[PDB]
Design a protein around this nucleic acid. Structure first.
Lengths: 59, 59
RNA sequence: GGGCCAUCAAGGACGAUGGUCC
RNA sequence: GGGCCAUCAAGGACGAUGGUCC
């Protein structure tokens, strides 16, 4: 697993079509952004594992 | 652009082969990890833009 | 306007809301 | 053990180091 260290306002990159950003921090909480095409799925771990269970997002 | 909020010890997911984690915080600094295959590139924004300039890693 | 804390957010938005202090 | 600040890390490791305060 690759790891990196950055500060509020910086970014990271993946593949040739994905980019990630650290918009800020709030104690034990964190605020981050993602810049991938809607051609690929993007979800929290608390819900990605329920989507990939054999279903899709609700109405 | 998609934005999420996360906490130290939790994760996010992208595509069907990429996962991201927030290992902790350090004030204005942050510690984060990436769990993608080495079949896709993963670098900091401060260097990815120098790789894709027309060259590759120093080794 | 800012610091601190908590919750929601199948959301594609540099996402939202509540509490506390100045 | 923890808060704050700074640096290295083309790194694939839940990466490293320094300053400051309690």
């Amino acid at each position: 697993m690759l790891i990196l260290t950055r500060k509020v306002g910086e970014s990271i990159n993946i593949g040739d079509d994905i980019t990630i950003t650290i918009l800020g921090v709030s104690g034990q909480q964190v605020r981050i952004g993602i810049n991938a095409p809607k051609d690929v799925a993007v979800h929290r771990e608390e819900i990605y594992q329920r989507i990939q269970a054999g279903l899709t997002a609700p109405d």
